């Protein structure tokens, strides 16, 4: 078995992953127990549409199954045109600089053909959870934040709703030099500009990779733009947990952060299983040092190589198998192999738990299992710079959760509380009295006690004070009646 | 296809290479010619006479650009900037049509950032009817006189 | 598109006039894609220029 492999010159911790999980399958004890896995060397720029589609050729001459790329838009809708005509499929993982939202590669692919490279990557759904964010806060005015490397293309019908809803925007580029940008726009803007800039940062939006949105949120800090009068959000897909928390440490003001979540198992030791099968602990353990510097990445490219592995057993199973195909390009003698399409059939309508979740392809071969995940700090004289999680957001229902619960409260319900009391019209009387013990109680005082415990839940168990006073205390400093009572907290 | 098409000009025989065809297959004959050195005059084209912006693709940094940009690079940016600021606009929207590449009024919407407007951006869907009608469930008076 | 294509015609008219005004004529250049004929050529950088 051959699989067809293209990586970016810089990317090789996809390559590295890729290898990895070969080895994986080839030392699993079940899965394609008469066949090796394997590969040739190849490395590309990621930005040569002509040499990809060649080292592509070269590998569907030398004999593959399938293709795998991690390359730039351009290339890989090259590739793509490729298979519509050569019929092998194709798996494309998606890869930005530094990690900026993924938008869409949006080229224009011709529509009169079946699309032969699924996209392991889910559709775009980012700007409904910027307009669903919006719809919590009710922003009538903020600032959008953009890294020089997004597509805006994405955020497109996030602002198409927010138009449709009637609110007001402002948007900004993030130049690659960060320093000379703000600079430059201090040394520009008027002092009347740079008031209406300042006060504009007061609601904004940041949509940009992590270490830029870092580096922006330092230097706007060291600029010294906004104080804490501000509220802020961030969206993306990939933002790990330590990006998250340094985030939070250079943010100021409130901060609010999305990011993408998987529908893995919840119990963290059955994550690295999958039936039978055994990940390597370095690519599954949340705790591993090299699995918290994973790029996403290697996810999908490990999740790639299982699914293959199980569409071809899946194959085997329906005894569809059949040889490894030949082909060449750009020969007029050229035409497709009808295996490479019931192999693309049987990968598009295969599938498994990888890292990454439940992975199958819709209609469109984009994977439907979206899911984000959304935070933010929760200050407090308890905690400092706390943090907790807000919600979680699907395009079913939306926001999960809430943003603007404020905080945790000591919501007295379910707490029984002993109130002391004493008796005088129409304040305090008592009504019924049971071996003893007074049972019943009316008056205006048991009218504002009802009042209270019917929103704040509590329960009430009420007693009669020793000897009613309101009185003085006695000589020694002890205290009597209705007052000691609560001297000694005896009573609540 | 196009790529194909071009390395059989090739195969007859050519002094240089003209194209007029969409960023999307441009991007690759431009990768061709990084390799082959011909020539390649492009110029670029719009879906259903959408404005046009400059294709930005993901084009290698390492080797000469043997493109020659028959249609001059975008300006409708600071034409745009310049008629707002005439006019001393404080709020204004975008709206463009489906086939649009917003990409280029990023330069615009940086400039108009120092000015400190009010801005917002819609998509024109061309079931137009559904698209407004739909206002009369979906929006309070307030919404559709804000509108 | 139609002006700009009348325009790059016109100017190629006019660089191969001007190819042949510098002495600079050569007869046509051929080449193949994905095969080993497929290398750099310092006259199609020529052309270019």
Redesign the interface.
């Known amino acids: 078995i051959h699989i067809g492999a293209i990586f970016d010159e810089s990317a090789k911790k996809d390559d590295e992953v890729f290898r990895t999980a070969v080895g994986d399958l080839n030392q699993n004890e079940e899965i394609l127990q008469t066949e090796k896995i394997t590969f040739s060397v190849t490395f590309v720029?990621?930005?040569?549409?002509?040499?990809a589609?060649?080292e592509a050729?070269e590998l569907m001459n030398q004999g593959i199954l399938a293709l795998v790329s991690s390359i730039?838009?351009?290339?890989a809708?090259?590739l793509q045109?490729l298979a519509d005509?050569m019929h092998i499929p194709h798996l494309f993982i998606q890869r930005s600089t530094a990690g900026t939202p993924r938008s869409g590669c949006g080229?224009?692919?011709s529509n009169r053909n079946d699309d032969y490279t699924l996209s392991v990557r889910p559709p775009v759904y980012l700007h409904d959870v910027i307009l669903r964010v919006v719809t919590e806060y009710a922003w009538q005015?903020f600032?959008i934040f953009y890294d020089s490397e997004y597509?805006?293309?994405g955020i497109?019908?996030f602002?198409?709703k927010?138009?449709?809803?009637?609110?007001?925007?402002?948007?900004?580029?993030v130049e690659n030099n960060i320093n000379k940008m703000i600079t430059t726009?201090f040394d520009?803007?008027r002092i009347e500009?740079l008031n209406?800039?300042r006060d504009?940062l007061r609601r904004a939006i940041l949509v940009m990779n992590p270490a830029t949105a870092k580096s922006f949120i330092t230097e706007v800090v060291e600029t010294n733009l906004v104080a804490f009068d501000c509220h802020w959000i961030i969206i993306n897909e990939e933002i790990n947990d330590v990006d998250v928390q340094e985030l939070v440490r250079r943010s100021i003001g409130r901060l609010t952060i999305i990011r993408q979540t998987f529908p893995v198992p919840q119990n963290i030791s059955q994550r690295c299983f999958r039936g039978n099968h055994r990940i390597s602990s370095t690519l599954c353990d949340p705790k591993d040092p090299f699995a918290q510097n994973m790029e996403i990445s290697n996810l999908y490219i490990y999740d790639t190589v299982l699914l293959l592995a199980n569409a071809f057993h899946k194959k085997l199973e329906d005894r569809k198998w059949h040889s490894m195909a030949s082909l060449?390009?750009?020969?007029k003698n050229s035409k497709p192999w009808q295996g490479g399409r019931s192999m693309l059939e049987t990968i598009k309508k295969g599938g498994v738990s990888g890292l990454t979740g439940e992975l199958e392809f819709g209609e469109n071969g984009g994977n439907p299992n979206v899911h984000f995940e959304i935070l933010g700090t929760n200050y407090g004289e308890e905690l400092g710079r706390g943090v907790r999680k807000l919600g979680c957001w699907n395009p079913v229902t939306g926001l999960n959760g809430s943003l603007t619960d404020k905080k945790l409260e000591n919501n007295m319900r379910g707490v029984v509380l002993r109130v002391v009391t004493v008796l005088e019209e129409p304040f305090v009387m008592v009504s019924e009295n049971v071996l003893g013990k007074p049972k019943k109680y009316q008056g205006f005082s048991i009218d504002v006690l009802d009042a209270l415990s019917n929103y704040l839940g509590f329960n009430y168990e009420i007693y009669v004070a020793p000897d009613h006073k309101y009185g003085s205390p006695q000589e020694d400093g002890t205290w009597n009646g209705l007052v000691g009572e609560l001297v000694f907290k005896r009573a609540d």
């Open positions: 720029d990621g930005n040569n549409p002509f040499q589609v060649q050729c730039g838009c351009t290339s809708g090259s045109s005509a080229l224009t692919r005015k600032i597509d805006i293309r497109q019908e602002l198409d927010v138009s449709q809803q009637g609110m007001d925007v402002a948007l900004q580029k726009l520009t803007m500009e209406r800039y504009t060449s390009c750009i020969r």
